[PDB]
Structure formats: C-alpha cells, structure tokens
Amino acid sequence: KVPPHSLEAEQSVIGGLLLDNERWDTVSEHVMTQDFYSRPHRLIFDGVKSILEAGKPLDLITLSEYLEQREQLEDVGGFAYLADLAKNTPSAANINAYAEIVAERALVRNLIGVANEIADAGYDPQGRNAEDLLDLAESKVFAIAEARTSENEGPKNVDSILERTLERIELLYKTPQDGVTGVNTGFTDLNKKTAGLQGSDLIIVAARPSMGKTTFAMNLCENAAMEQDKPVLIFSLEMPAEQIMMRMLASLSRVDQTKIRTGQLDDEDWARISSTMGILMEKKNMYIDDSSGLTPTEVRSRARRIAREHGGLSLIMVDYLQLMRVPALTDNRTLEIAEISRSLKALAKELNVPVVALSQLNRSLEQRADKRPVNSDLRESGSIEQDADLIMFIYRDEVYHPDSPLKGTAEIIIGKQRNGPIGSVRLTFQGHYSRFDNYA
Amino acid sequence: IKVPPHSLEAEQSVIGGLLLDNERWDTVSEHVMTQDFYSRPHRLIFDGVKSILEAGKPLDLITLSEYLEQREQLEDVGGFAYLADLAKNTPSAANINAYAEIVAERALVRNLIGVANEIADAGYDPQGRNAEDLLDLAESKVFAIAEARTSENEGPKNVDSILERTLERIELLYKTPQDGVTGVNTGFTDLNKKTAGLQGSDLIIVAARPSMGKTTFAMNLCENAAMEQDKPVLIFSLEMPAEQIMMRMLASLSRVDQTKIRTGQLDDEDWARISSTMGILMEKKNMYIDDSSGLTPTEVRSRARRIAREHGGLSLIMVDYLQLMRVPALTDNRTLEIAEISRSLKALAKELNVPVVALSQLNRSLEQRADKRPVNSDLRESGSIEQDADLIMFIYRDEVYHPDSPLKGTAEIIIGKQRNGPIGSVRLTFQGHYSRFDNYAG
Amino acid sequence: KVPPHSLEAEQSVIGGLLLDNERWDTVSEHVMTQDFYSRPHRLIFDGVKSILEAGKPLDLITLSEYLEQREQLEDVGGFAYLADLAKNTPSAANINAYAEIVAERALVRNLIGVANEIADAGYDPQGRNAEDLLDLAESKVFAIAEARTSENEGPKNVDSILERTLERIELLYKTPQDGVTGVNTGFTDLNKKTAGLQGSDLIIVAARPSMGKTTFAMNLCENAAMEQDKPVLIFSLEMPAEQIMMRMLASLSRVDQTKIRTGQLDDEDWARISSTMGILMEKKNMYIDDSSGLTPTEVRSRARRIAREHGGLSLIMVDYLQLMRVPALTDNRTLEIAEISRSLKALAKELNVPVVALSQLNRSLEQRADKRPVNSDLRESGSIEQDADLIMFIYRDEVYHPDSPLKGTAEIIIGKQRNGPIGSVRLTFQGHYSRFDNYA
Amino acid sequence: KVPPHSLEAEQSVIGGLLLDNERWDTVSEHVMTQDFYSRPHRLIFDGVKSILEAGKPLDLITLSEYLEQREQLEDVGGFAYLADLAKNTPSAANINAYAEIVAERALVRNLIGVANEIADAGYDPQGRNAEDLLDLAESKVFAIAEARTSENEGPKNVDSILERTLERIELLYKTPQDGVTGVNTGFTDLNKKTAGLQGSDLIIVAARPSMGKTTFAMNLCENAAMEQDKPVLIFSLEMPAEQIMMRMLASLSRVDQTKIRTGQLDDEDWARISSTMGILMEKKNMYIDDSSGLTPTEVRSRARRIAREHGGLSLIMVDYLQLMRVPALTDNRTLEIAEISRSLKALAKELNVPVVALSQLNRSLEQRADKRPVNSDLRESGSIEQDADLIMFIYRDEVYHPDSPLKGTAEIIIGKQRNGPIGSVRLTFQGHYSRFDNYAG
Ligand SMILES: Nc1nc2c(ncn2[C@@H]2O[C@H](COP(=O)(O)OP(=O)(O)O)[C@@H](O)[C@H]2O)c(=O)[nH]1
Ligand SMILES: Nc1nc2c(ncn2[C@@H]2O[C@H](COP(=O)(O)OP(=O)(O)O)[C@@H](O)[C@H]2O)c(=O)[nH]1
Ligand SMILES: Nc1nc2c(ncn2[C@@H]2O[C@H](COP(=O)(O)OP(=O)(O)O)[C@@H](O)[C@H]2O)c(=O)[nH]1
Ligand SMILES: Nc1nc2c(ncn2[C@@H]2O[C@H](COP(=O)(O)OP(=O)(O)O)[C@@H](O)[C@H]2O)c(=O)[nH]1
Ligand code: ALF
Ligand code: ALF
Ligand code: ALF
Ligand code: ALF
Ligand SMILES: [Mg+2]
Ligand SMILES: [Mg+2]
Ligand SMILES: [Mg+2]
Ligand SMILES: [Mg+2]
C-alpha cells in the first residue's frame, strides 16, 4: 500500500516560491517541514524556512549554498534537482492552493500513523488495560484535530472586528435584555454584568480553600437545572455524589446542612425537603460524576454520551481543575494544568455550552495582606488566564476579619471577562443552607 | 499474522464458575453478554445460560446439555466432555465478577482494533473521501466504543440512583436516636454539637504551635475512641515512642499526674486508679501504636490494611506528625512531599471509610503576628494541607502567651475549617498534670 | 558449586498463596521479589505483589492475564507451570514458615556475593590500598546486617507495649534513682530533665559556631571519665589531641586557657595543675583520636578495639559530624550526613553506650532575628532528627547582645527527647577556664 | 590467581637493614615474621628479629651463622641469597616506607583468606543457619580491623598526650613570653586579646569593600617581616605586586600614597623612603605572588617551595579567598568556598604557620542599619566559620557617618576566637600612608 502523498504538489510549493518570495507570508500559514513526505523535499524546505524568515532573498544559488555548507546538496539530488524545480510550475498566486493539498495528504498520513499506533498497542498491550487503551487512542486522535485548529488563527484586521463589534451592539439593543442571554445564573445583580453564562466559552470560578467554590458552583447549577430545559453535567472529583446531594437539598429546601447530616429535622422541615424532590424529578437535568482522577479524554467521552442521549447539554461543571490529570504530562505539572485548561476550552466549543471549572489560588494573597483575589495568584498553578473567557473570584471579608462590615455577605469580584466588562457583585451568603442569594 | 485479543481461560472461568453457583448471574450478566465471547462454541454455550437463568430455572450440566442437544449444538460445541471439563475447572466462587471484567476487557480491545483497521483501510482507499471527511469518519467510529462503554463504579450517575441512595441515608439517621453524635464519638459534649462526630472517610487535621498539646489532644480523642467504638484504633507515633504514649494514656484515664508516673513514686490511693485503668484497657484491646521514626505513604497503607483485615475493620487512624512522614520520590522538593503525603492520607481515609486524624505544625508567622490566634494561612506555609482536608481544628491556650490570662487552665479548640458542618470555637478545661482535656462548665 | 537456593520452598510460597489470599499480610513481611533465585519465579511473584496490594482477587487466570499482556506467560513456562503450582502444596498457615526459608537461602546468597566482591577486589585492587580495601569490605558486610534488622519491625499490639512500659516503671521504682540513671552528666540541674546519658541511644549537641560545642562536650567528658569506671572515647576531627588537653587542664585546674597557651602561671596556679594530672592518671579513662577525615567504618573498628581491650566503653564522643565522610556517598551530601547519622545510632546500640555527636546549625537562625536554636536549622545539614534520641542546643545571649541579661550564663535548650521531656537548663559558663558549672 | 605479595619489597626491608642496624627501632613497629609471604624470607627475618633485639651487630656472617646452626642456610638459598640481598637496595631512611608496603600486601592476603573462609562456609553450611553464618562472617572481618593498629591517625592514651602537652607548657614558662606568643601582630592593644598569631591555625580578616582588608593584612605583614626571622608569603590576587609595594613604602616611610603614585615628593620625604629600603633588604622576608586565579593545589605547591628553600615559613597571607578557584567544584559556588576554606586550614597545619585569609561580607549588614559586622554576613559566601580558628572584622564609623565619634580610628571587632576570648580593639587608622597604629586615650 502506497502512503498518501503528492510529489508534484510538494514540487509546486517550493518551485513557485523560488521565483516569488512575497508569497511566503500566506504559504507558511498552511504547511511546515513536517508536512513534506520525502527526505530530500524536507531538507530543501528546511533551508527555505530559515532564509525567508530572516528576510534574505531566496533563489537557486542562495539555497544551494545553505545545502553545500551542510553537505546536503549532493544528498537532495545535486543542483540539477534545484534547477528542474525552478523550471517546473512557473505559475504564481495559486501557491496557497498548492500548500493546502500538501497539508491534505500529510494530515491523512498522520491519521494512518495514529491508526497503526492504536492497532499495534492493541495486540501488544504490555500492562495497558481496556480503559487505558481507550484514553491512549482518543488522546492521539484529538492531537490531529487540535493541530488542525491551531493554524489560520493570528491577528485581525479592522474589517473583521468592526463587523463583529457593530453586530453585538445591534443584537443587544434589539432584544429586551433584562441581563439574561444564554444560561441564567439565578442572580439578578450578577446577570447585569455577566449577561448570562454564554455558550462555547470557558468560565473559571476561583477562590481560597473553604471560601465556597463548590458552594457557589452548585448554587449556579441549582438554577441551571430549573431554568434551562437541557441537562446539566457535573464532575465531582473532591467530594462524592452523596455529599453534593445533601448540599443541594439544603440549598433548595432552605434547611441547615447540620440537620441533614445528623438526620434530625421536624415535620415543618420535612415539608420543605418533600417540595424539593418533586421539582428535581420533573426535569431530571442533574448528572453527577463521582470520579477521583479524571483524564481530559474521559471528560470528553462522558460529555458526548449525555449530549447524544438527552438531545444536548446546557452546562458542564468541574469540582476541581487541579484534581484532573493527564497521562502524557504527568511529570511536568505546569504543562499538565496548561493542557487540561486547553482541553476544557476546546470541549466548550465542541458542544457550544458554558464550562464552569473550579480552580484554587496560591497562598501568595494571604501573605500580600490585601487578601482580595487577583488573577496573578491563579497563574502560579498553570496557564489558565490565557484559555479562560470569564474569571470570577469569591471573597468573603468575614473569613479574614471576625466583625468585618457586611458580615454574611460575599462579593463575587469578576477578574476577567472577554465578552463584557469587569467589576464586583455583592450576594448574601447563607452558610447554614449553603445558599447564595441576591443582597438588598 | 497477529493473534486477536482474547483469553480462553477467562471465557471458561465465567461459565465454569456459574454452573456451580447460579446466584452470581445477577452481577455477572451486568458486565458481559453473548457478543463479548470470542470463539463460536463459547458463544453457543453462553446463549443457553442467558435463556435458562433468566426464567429462573436451575442451571447444571444436564439442563444446559438438553438445551444444546435439542438444537443439535451439543456435538458442535465439543460434546458433553467440554461441559464436563468446564465444571471440573475453576471451582472458585465470588471472583466470577472479576472474571467477567477481563472477558469484556479483551472484547473491547478487539472492537477497537476492528475500528483501527477500518480507519487504516479507508485511509489508503478513500474513494471520494477527503481529509475532512476521513477525520469525521475516524472520530465518530472511535466515540461509538466510548459511548457503548458503561462502566458502573466510575462514571455518570442519573438523579434516580443518587436520590434513592441519599434519602436512604437520611431515613436511617432519622430512625436511630442520634443524640448529636454521628460516626465516631470525640468524648466532649460541647465539641460533638459543632463537629457532629468524627465522620467516616474524611480527613481531619489537628494543628497547633509546639508544646500546645497536639499529641495530648489527639490521644485524648483516642482515649474515648477505644472505649466508645467497638472497632480498633490505629496510632502512628513518629516523634515519641510507644512507651511515652502509654505513660500519657495511664495519666489521662487514672487521673494521676505524669510527674508521679515518670518518677515511679505514687501512694496506694494513686495505684488503685492505675489498677482500674488496665482492666478496661485489656477488655477491648482496641489501641495499636506504631513506633516508627520515618514512615512512607506506602508503609502507612500496608500497615492500615493489615489491622483492618485481622480485626474485622478499623475505626480511627491517627498520625503523631505529618511533617515527620517522608516520600522517597519527592525527597528533594519539600512542598511536593507534604502535598503528596496529605493527598495519600485523604485517599487512605476513603479506602477504609474511617476518619484520619493527622497532626501538623503551624509556621512561626503567628508569633510575629501579635494576635497569636491560629489561622489556616500559617499551615499553608508547610505545604498543600487545606485543599485535601475536610476538618481543621486548632489548639489555642491563652495561658501560654500570657501568664495571668483569663480562663487559665482552659484551652479553646478553634475550628478553622469544616466542609461537612459549620466553623466556630469550643472551650475545654485542660489539666496539664494528668494530660487531660475535659468539658468546661460555666 | 551450587548457589544456596530451594526451588520447592519458592514454589511453596506462591503455590499456597494462590489458594489463600489472606496470608499475604504476613508473607510480604518476610520476603520480596529480590529474594527469589530463578528468573521465572521472580516474574510470577512480581505479579502477585501488584495484584494483592490493590486488594484484587488472586487466582490462576488473574495472574495468567498479568503475564500474557506483558508476554511473560510463555517465558515463565506457559499456563502448565501455574497449573502445577496450584496443584502442589495444598497446605495453609505454614506459608509464613516457607517465606522464612526463602529469605534464609537468599541472605546466604547475598553474603557469598559480598564475600566474592571482597576476594575479587583483593586480587584486583586498581589503586585501592589496604586501608581502602578494609573499609570497602566492612561497609558491604554491614549492609547485610542492616537489612536483616529492617525486617519484622511494623505495628505493635498493646500486649507487647504494656509489658515493656510496666517493666520500665517497676525497675525505676525499685532502684534508688537520685535523678542519675546511666551516665552522670556532672550537672545537677541537667540530670533532673535528662535523667542521665542513657545507654545505646544517640545524643546530638548542636550550636552556632564558637558557641561552645567542643567546650560543652568536653565538660561532659570531664565528669564521664571521673564518675564512670569504664573508659571514654573521643574522636577529635577539627582540633588536635594537644588542644583538647589544654582545654581539659583549664576545666579541672580552673586556671584560664590564656595562661596555658602562653605558659605564664605562678606557683599557686601550678599547684592546681599538679592536682589535675594525679586524678587523670589514676583512672586513665580518656582516649583521643586526632584524625581529620574519619569514615563510618573507621569509627566502628576503633570503637570495638578499645571496648575489647579495656573491658568495655562508657561514652563515645565525636568533635564534628560534618567533618566525617563516607566513600560511597561522596557526591550526594544529603545522603552522606543521613548515612553517618544512621551509622552512629547503630554503633550506639552495638556497644550499648551513649554516643555524643557534635553538629552545626545552618545560618537560617541568624537571619530569623529570634536566634534561639530550633531543630529546623539542623535539618538543612541532613537527616539527623529522625535518627537522634536526644538533641540539646547551646544558646548564650551574651554572643548576640553585649549587655544581655544573665551575662556569663548559657541555657542548654533541649529541642528533642524520645525517652523523657523537653525544656531548658541554665548553666554558668566560665569562658576563661572553658567550664560549664551549675547556675545558682 | 596470584596472592597479593611483593618479593622486591620483602627484599628491600632486609637488604637495607643489614647495612643500617639503627633503623630496626621503627621498622619492627610496622612488620613482623608473619607479614612475610615466602618461607625463605620468613626464616631470614626470624633471625634478624632475634639478633637485633639483644643488641648484637647484624651483618652477612652473623646472620649466616644463625641459619647454619639451625641448618636453614642451605634451605633459604645458600650464602648467595644473603650476598645478593646486601648488594641490592643500598638506600637508607626509606626502609620505614618499605615496611609499610609489606604490611599492605599481608593485610590484603589475610582479608582474602577470610573472604574465602566465608564463601566456603556459605556453600558448605553443615548445620549453620543464615543467622549463624552472618555472625561468623562479621566476627572474622572485625578480627582484621582489630589487628590493624595504624599509628599517625590511631587512638592516643592520656600518657602520650599529657607528656606532649606538659612539654609545651614547660618550654613556654621557660622563655620570656611578654604577652606575644607565636607571631607578633605589631599592635600592643591587639596582642593582649589575640595572644599573638598562633601557629597552624586559620585566621580570617573580613570587612566591607574599601574598609581596609588589604591595608590591615599588609600592616600585619610589615611587622611580621621585621619581627619574625622566617620569611612571609603573600598571595596577591586582586592587585599586582607593584601596587602592594607602593602601599608598603607608604606604611613604613610614613609618606602619603598620593605622593608615591604621582612621584612628586621632596628631599625630606625621600630620606624616609631611603631608610625603609635599607631594613627591607637586610632580612628579605617578603614574598609576593601576583596571580589572578590560584587553585588550592597551586597554593600548597608554592608554599612548600619557599618553606624548603628558606628553612621554613612564618606567615602565609591571601589577598582574596573569593578570587581563589577550584577546578572540580567550579559549578557549585557554595562547595567551592567550603573546599577552599578547608584546604587553607589543612595547609596551616601542614606547615604549622598562621594563615591570614581575606574574605568579603555580604551586603546584608548595609540593609541591617546597625552596619557593625557579624559572622552571619560571612556565612552567605560559604562555609568559613566552621573551618576558621580566629575571625576579626574591620569597622570604621567614619565610612557610614561623616562626623562620627573617634574619626580616623577603626575598631577591629573579634567575631570568633577558638583559642582565646572575643572582643574589640581600637586602632588609629592613617588613610594617607595606609597605616594602622595603636590608639592612645
Ligand atoms: N454555618 C454553616 N456553614 C457551613 C455548613 N456546611 C458548610 N459550611 C460552610 O460552607 C463553606 C463550604 O465551602 P466549600 O465549597 O466546600 O469549599 P471550597 O470548595 O474549598 O471553597 C465553608 O466556608 C463552610 O464553613 C453548615 O452546616 N453551617
Ligand atoms: N503540669 C504539667 N504539664 C505537663 C506535664 N507533662 C506534660 N505537660 C504539658 O503538656 C503539654 C504536652 O504537649 P505535647 O502534645 O507533647 O506537644 P505538641 O505535640 O508539640 O503540641 C505541654 O504543654 C507540657 O508542658 C506534667 O507532668 N505536668
Ligand atoms: N574568655 C575566654 N574565652 C575563651 C578562651 N578560650 C576560648 N574561649 C571561648 O570559648 C568558646 C570555645 O568554643 P568552641 O567549642 O571551640 O567552638 P564550637 O565548637 O564551634 O562551638 C568560644 O566562645 C571562645 O570565645 C579564653 O582563654 N578566654
Ligand atoms: N586618605 C587616603 N586614603 C587612601 C589613600 N589610598 C587609599 N586610601 C584608602 O585606604 C583604603 C584602602 O582599602 P583596601 O584595603 O584597598 O580595600 P579592601 O581590601 O576592599 O577593604 C580605602 O578606604 C581608601 O579610601 C590615599 O592616598 N589617601
Ligand atoms: F478546600 Al476545597 F474545594 F473544599 F479547596
Ligand atoms: F513540640 Al511537638 F509535637 F512535641 F511539635
Ligand atoms: F567553630 Al566550631 F566547632 F570551633 F563550629
Ligand atoms: F574592594 Al576590595 F579588596 F579592594 F574588597
Ligand atoms: Mg470544592
Ligand atoms: Mg507531638
Ligand atoms: Mg568544635
Ligand atoms: Mg583587597
């Protein structure tokens, strides 16, 4: 069987670039040295990539001298190969189209290389289980799909920006806003600044330990399961599915958590518990995943399952970003968090649903004396701010100071917002029932 | 030529062990089906098993033989000799659920190779299919195996399964007379009101400044834990030996000063209280002390599993010092050493479903702070503890910092963190002589 | 010659563990993967160690699948080897006895491997001298004796603890204590907390440079040579035997060191010097080793010599723990200090005599502003606190502050004590005569 | 396999002892009859041990008659073996070194004999268990370590120490001390606390840059070359030999450095310069090494050279401890300084002369506001305090404060002293002539 490649297409990219150097700006955007099939073609392009990047003029002799010094000239096929290359394809402007068909053959070749990697790992497991082999197969397949999206990105001209900016103002003015657009948060004061939990964008809710990360995230999921028709998916890594349910019953029935974990509660308290269960089983939107160490592959497979089974998802939530692990970057922690954050943003776009990830801030804010959470304390964990579209921090002054002003009232300080503006929203926190309500 | 992923012994173990015990079919049918079996004779035999056991009819060597004989599949599977040797092989029970998992394991990999070969053959032979078209065809076929995979224990749960499990917990709690205590009794009535007992499977950290009474308060919990709870208590003494712990134990229960014990001088009246202590101690024999200097997170797990398997199961695990514990891999990085030790202790608590009481020390930052009231920030300097912990309680005695401080001889256990319940402060009278923590009245 | 091994004993351990999984708790305590002779037996046990550790059931097929995936099944001897293993030895409970005889053959095999290592190094030295070859032979022999003691340690039931605790209290109440138990320190205020320098336990005296580490250690040895009948051994690494003697004469005669090193002293001063020599030569308990760089093997050999020659030792003292060196762990300093501290504790138990080691604290305490020595400043040097049974620090406030309160009075702050309690003892320091006396 | 032995080494011990009988006193201390490999060599030495012990003269015929009577002469190899033995190795004094290598081969031979004993007992246990075989192996190994009595490093009883200590005090009481003991510093106020620059101990003079580290060190060397008869060695790393000489001429002639570097000075100033040169060339004790980056090996080799050439040294001085480098620990700076400090202390003991090393303190004292040098500021550079026997810091208040009290007077604060006490000595500093003189008032 012959591998998918086109020798004429590889010759057309280099052959037409020797005559016109100006086309390199758009040609380099589509292909690289790795995309070329044969070894002499890879060696020739490796010189092209170096000469044209510096801004130096590229021709038949300038490229020949780069190969002659490295003694690759007699290896590629002498000067006769370079001479026949300039002679062939004297066409211009269509070089961008020639670069697309080189990337086309290379992508299929990379896909077969991954398909054979899965097959060889299947017959020869060497300790690898069915669960381990499933993650290895999907992670390698996603690498081709991830590389296919990193291309064509870069800076933007005013034409594309103005059209996108004016359309945003027009649609906002047209619709009767009332804050809500997309997914309802449940808080009127928050909806004014947030403009609802937008689809396909990554949301990170970060706070100091025992501030109420899981509490506030669940408080969003209470209203997300009630308001939105489509189901809500929750990945509980830290605490089990049972503990989440006790906090859920307390938030909706509005009866203290201490009464639930002990079991002692009167007939009056039981009536509020009874009313909660009824509304919960009418929609059945809530789904909890009580898994200790999830992989970015396992999150994708389980999200696709519920979306295919129940029409489609509405909101995905993660109990802990740090508790998630990647098998490839286990050694490097900085790259582990960077890839997990990159995988969660790509999962949001894949399903067009808001992803609410919970992350913890470094001890730097406690030493800082100000103790008001800043984005810099979260950068110490890994690359989160770059991938995130909306970052909101939970800060309760009653934690640091005993008789602090507005005791029992927390302020959700919005540290980052790509879509809208940044600020701070005060919400009354009821510790007993683990509820976040609108402050008046 | 490559051999497909299958195990003939694993396929034989599922059927072979199910012929003797019919009751196991309830959990075995949950993992595998007729399609999961590799060879044709194995598929024909299981197809009969699936039909006989579903009706509730007894399954044996002849009942299964008659199902095959009527369909003329008996001479095709390998006669009665194949069925006879199947019942003879693997006379083991209960591990049939584990045998069903490895049959599904080989079948899933076999399905994955079938998809991997489908992608490879479509790659070389596109027939109109473009790179974009081939990418969608490859991912959709791979996702079909991940969608069909319905692993129970780890994976998604619908509200129906969760609500039923949650409501059964509240029902059993409302039925039984709670009296505040839920799980493990601390021994202090004022503490039990806020703590709601030492909950199972959650991580508890008792942190204080040196010589405040970390080992003293932890042992004071273990005095009542060995008396109240029927299941044994495990203690890992890293700092001080097993002998020193016992002298503090005898002083706490007999209520005779430690200074009398270490010198040996005590009257007949003092000896009578010592005598009464030993009697109750040897009636239950719940106390277990590990006098090891530098324990590893692997050594803690192995020793905890031993006592749990030998004495039915544990009730409470205690560590004398979190900082004295060491990890061989992260010896160079101290921040990662403490982070992994704290992560290992929480995972050990969940593994045995028992409260783990770890003792940690706070940084000198609180002494410079002038307030000297312990805060969680002083413990974060040691490593990642607050993130893993479920309950953090600090020991603060005002008589240490100030000589004639108000409520002298009374310490306040300030609860810095509680994931399950609320946070506060509980005052308990501290008797330094006998190394006892008792309930304060007033 | 056939190596010491038993194939039936190796087969009996695995063969009886396949049927009864519950026995692994006590079997794993005696043997490991390294103890098995043949390669197929090592591969089979390596699977047993992994499956039973997780808690997963161990049988004929579960173990076969672990080998089949790693392609070790056809290498160990097919399924027929595993089948005949389960058939053989159907006995239970005696598996713990089978594990002991596997460790027995393996220990002798390791001893021969060390015996051949010494013999081959003898004929082929390659730069190694007689002194170098002696240290290499003893260090390798001690490694087998050290591994023989690390086993069978683990958790303890109340039965073993109570019997050991009650025997300690009974013997203490029986004997007329008078504070002192074991070796007399010479200080009445110190003896109350220390309860004498206990036998077989490791003692570390740590302080900041020029605080009086050598001064206080010698002040203990003054009284140790006078009170105790058995001789005292001192390893002087930093200063020579002559300098130690001048400090010794000054401490007992009570005449300033400055008079001795200059030689100018009157008839009244000479009479006190004369009285010192008389008592010194009556017992002759003092022994000084003026060696620059001692090895843990050299310390053991020289300690055994004096103990065998003079009935037995009473107290061993080291001038500097950091000045001692190990030839194997020369590159890694953290492991060098860790092994030296581990060797000194094992030497104390071997001779049942208190070992007084002198160590220096890191500069961290000077930057700390408090300047009161803590155990954390000593951990920076290496693993000392874990091995040590008693740690006492020397802190003189007159060093840091000129007109400090209680000038000429040092406080011996006990940082660690495994046997008894921790505190602080004030002793009057006389810099002139290099004496530590009881403060009143 | 050939057993560890040296026939030439066995021949060298006896061969060189036949000519010089006086060496037996130190040769018998290292080896015995058992240490000799071959049987004829053992028989010959057995006679040597008996004849020389009585005090009888040992030669070719006296030893031959001892063997001839016992009929061992024809067994050892006739008189021809004894004749060729006296002919071979006509060297003397190195016989003690030949005895050490005979004991070296014998100890390894005994170790192999024990190693083979363990191996043979391992394969053939005959009732012996693993616990029994472990005790048998260790007890036999310890027997070689117990028999090993290495002199130079081994244990010393109080009898040998007291006799050596009392002889030191006796010689010191006999000679007129006058406070100064060892090397004269030149300062009367300093000599009272320091008790002279003691031999074989390491001295570190540390101060903040431009305080006068090189100035004070040279001020010690001015008096060290004048008072002490034995030469003084100086390793100038920072500045060259010429710059050191201009500071030297200024200190003794007592004429400002600014006049010397410009060259302008009157006949009155030249007369003081003239008097300096005269006294300098009368003793010629000063030696300067203008090398940029010296290694601890290069310092040892150059110190041994001057000591062997000029009878022996008196004081070794280093311009900069930090400027010195080690080729092995080039990457790790903390270990570089630690080994350099350890090498300089071992060099001091090797030559029994005070080593004056100059080191710089960290910027921590400037931030501290007190600015009075403490030992903690020097620990940041490396491991110096642990190796050092005497540390003295230079602190001038006129540097930090313009009109500071006692302007032109520096205080040498003694931070460490293992031998004597710690304090502070005030000395008047004359910046012009780069002189440190005794302060009065
Ligand atoms: N008053 C009260 N507070 C509670 C109760 N249960 C939990 N809390 C508080 O609710 C918060 C829970 O925060 P959580 O989300 O689990 O922590 P995080 O995810 O680390 O930020 C903590 O501040 C607890 O003190 C309860 O029963 N009563
Ligand atoms: N009055 C008195 N106090 C004692 C006695 N024994 C111990 N203590 C005190 O009890 C406390 C023991 O604390 P400990 O748990 O060992 O220290 P930690 O683990 O570092 O906090 C200290 O405050 C001691 O002063 C005794 O016999 N009498
Ligand atoms: N007053 C006085 N102090 C002295 C004399 N000799 C030594 N010292 C002091 O005694 C101490 C000796 O400490 P040393 O044990 O050698 O140092 P370390 O081992 O590094 O702690 C130092 O503080 C010296 O200053 C002396 O003759 N007079
Ligand atoms: N007044 C005056 N001071 C001088 C003269 N030459 C040098 N000095 C001072 O003498 C000192 C020399 O110190 P030096 O030992 O070289 O520096 P260090 O080794 O870094 O401490 C400095 O404080 C200079 O300012 C001079 O001609 N006149
Ligand atoms: F302490 Al948490 F999520 F409960 F960081
Ligand atoms: F001082 Al402690 F446990 F006894 F920290
Ligand atoms: F300075 Al030292 F022992 F004399 F550390
Ligand atoms: F500045 Al310098 F020696 F001259 F440190
Ligand atoms: Mg959480
Ligand atoms: Mg403790
Ligand atoms: Mg010392
Ligand atoms: Mg200088």
Short mmCIF file of N, CA and C in Angstrom, two decimals, chain A residues 360-402:
data_model
loop_
_atom_site.label_atom_id
_atom_site.label_comp_id
_atom_site.label_asym_id
_atom_site.label_seq_id
_atom_site.Cartn_x
_atom_site.Cartn_y
_atom_site.Cartn_z
N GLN A 360 -8.06 26.61 42.36
CA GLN A 360 -7.63 27.21 43.61
C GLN A 360 -6.47 28.18 43.41
N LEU A 361 -6.48 29.28 44.17
CA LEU A 361 -5.45 30.32 44.13
C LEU A 361 -4.29 29.95 45.06
N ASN A 362 -3.07 30.43 44.74
CA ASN A 362 -1.86 30.20 45.53
C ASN A 362 -1.91 31.02 46.83
N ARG A 363 -1.15 30.57 47.86
CA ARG A 363 -1.06 31.20 49.18
C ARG A 363 -0.49 32.64 49.18
N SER A 364 -0.07 33.14 48.00
CA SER A 364 0.51 34.48 47.79
C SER A 364 -0.39 35.63 48.27
N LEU A 365 -1.72 35.48 48.12
CA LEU A 365 -2.70 36.50 48.53
C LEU A 365 -2.81 36.67 50.06
N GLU A 366 -2.56 35.58 50.82
CA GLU A 366 -2.61 35.57 52.29
C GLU A 366 -1.43 36.35 52.87
N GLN A 367 -0.26 36.26 52.20
CA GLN A 367 0.99 36.94 52.57
C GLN A 367 0.95 38.41 52.15
N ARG A 368 0.20 38.71 51.07
CA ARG A 368 0.02 40.03 50.44
C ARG A 368 -0.68 41.08 51.33
N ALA A 369 -1.35 40.65 52.43
CA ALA A 369 -2.10 41.45 53.42
C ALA A 369 -3.45 41.99 52.91
N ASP A 370 -3.54 42.33 51.60
CA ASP A 370 -4.77 42.83 50.95
C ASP A 370 -5.84 41.73 50.93
N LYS A 371 -5.41 40.47 50.65
CA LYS A 371 -6.21 39.24 50.62
C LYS A 371 -7.39 39.25 49.61
N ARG A 372 -7.51 40.32 48.79
CA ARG A 372 -8.54 40.43 47.75
C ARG A 372 -8.00 39.67 46.52
N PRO A 373 -8.63 38.54 46.11
CA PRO A 373 -8.07 37.73 45.00
C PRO A 373 -7.83 38.45 43.67
N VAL A 374 -6.60 38.28 43.14
CA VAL A 374 -6.12 38.83 41.86
C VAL A 374 -5.78 37.64 40.95
N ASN A 375 -5.81 37.85 39.62
CA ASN A 375 -5.50 36.85 38.59
C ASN A 375 -4.09 36.25 38.69
N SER A 376 -3.12 37.04 39.20
CA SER A 376 -1.71 36.66 39.38
C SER A 376 -1.51 35.45 40.32
N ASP A 377 -2.39 35.28 41.32
CA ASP A 377 -2.36 34.18 42.29
C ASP A 377 -2.77 32.84 41.64
N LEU A 378 -3.53 32.90 40.53
CA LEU A 378 -4.01 31.74 39.79
C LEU A 378 -3.02 31.29 38.70
N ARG A 379 -2.16 32.21 38.21
CA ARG A 379 -1.14 31.95 37.18
C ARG A 379 -0.03 31.02 37.68
N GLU A 380 0.18 30.97 39.02
CA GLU A 380 1.18 30.13 39.71
C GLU A 380 0.85 28.64 39.58
N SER A 381 -0.46 28.30 39.43
CA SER A 381 -0.97 26.94 39.26
C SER A 381 -0.66 26.41 37.85
N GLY A 382 -0.80 27.28 36.84
CA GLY A 382 -0.54 26.97 35.44
C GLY A 382 -1.09 28.02 34.49
N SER A 383 -1.24 27.64 33.20
CA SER A 383 -1.77 28.51 32.16
C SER A 383 -3.30 28.41 32.12
N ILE A 384 -3.98 29.30 32.87
CA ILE A 384 -5.44 29.33 32.99
C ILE A 384 -6.04 30.60 32.35
N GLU A 385 -5.49 31.79 32.70
CA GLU A 385 -5.93 33.11 32.22
C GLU A 385 -5.96 33.25 30.70
N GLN A 386 -4.98 32.64 30.00
CA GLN A 386 -4.87 32.67 28.54
C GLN A 386 -6.02 31.96 27.82
N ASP A 387 -6.45 30.81 28.37
CA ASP A 387 -7.52 29.97 27.81
C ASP A 387 -8.92 30.43 28.22
N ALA A 388 -9.07 30.95 29.46
CA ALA A 388 -10.34 31.41 30.04
C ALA A 388 -10.95 32.63 29.35
N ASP A 389 -12.30 32.68 29.32
CA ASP A 389 -13.09 33.77 28.74
C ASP A 389 -13.76 34.61 29.83
N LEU A 390 -13.99 34.02 31.02
CA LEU A 390 -14.62 34.68 32.17
C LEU A 390 -14.10 34.10 33.49
N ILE A 391 -13.47 34.95 34.32
CA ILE A 391 -12.94 34.55 35.63
C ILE A 391 -13.61 35.37 36.73
N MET A 392 -14.22 34.68 37.71
CA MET A 392 -14.90 35.30 38.85
C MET A 392 -14.40 34.72 40.17
N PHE A 393 -13.98 35.59 41.10
CA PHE A 393 -13.43 35.20 42.40
C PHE A 393 -14.41 35.42 43.55
N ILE A 394 -14.42 34.49 44.53
CA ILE A 394 -15.27 34.57 45.72
C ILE A 394 -14.43 35.13 46.88
N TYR A 395 -14.86 36.27 47.44
CA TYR A 395 -14.17 36.92 48.55
C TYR A 395 -15.15 37.37 49.64
N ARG A 396 -15.06 36.72 50.80
CA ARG A 396 -15.86 36.97 51.99
C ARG A 396 -14.94 37.59 53.03
N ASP A 397 -15.23 38.84 53.43
CA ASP A 397 -14.42 39.57 54.41
C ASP A 397 -14.53 39.00 55.83
N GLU A 398 -15.63 38.26 56.12
CA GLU A 398 -15.89 37.63 57.43
C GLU A 398 -14.93 36.47 57.75
N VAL A 399 -14.24 35.93 56.72
CA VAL A 399 -13.27 34.83 56.85
C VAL A 399 -11.98 35.38 57.47
N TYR A 400 -11.44 36.48 56.91
CA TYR A 400 -10.22 37.13 57.36
C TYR A 400 -10.41 37.99 58.62
N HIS A 401 -11.56 38.68 58.73
CA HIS A 401 -11.87 39.55 59.87
C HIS A 401 -13.15 39.07 60.57
N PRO A 402 -13.16 38.94 61.92
CA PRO A 402 -14.36 38.43 62.61
C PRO A 402 -15.61 39.32 62.50
#
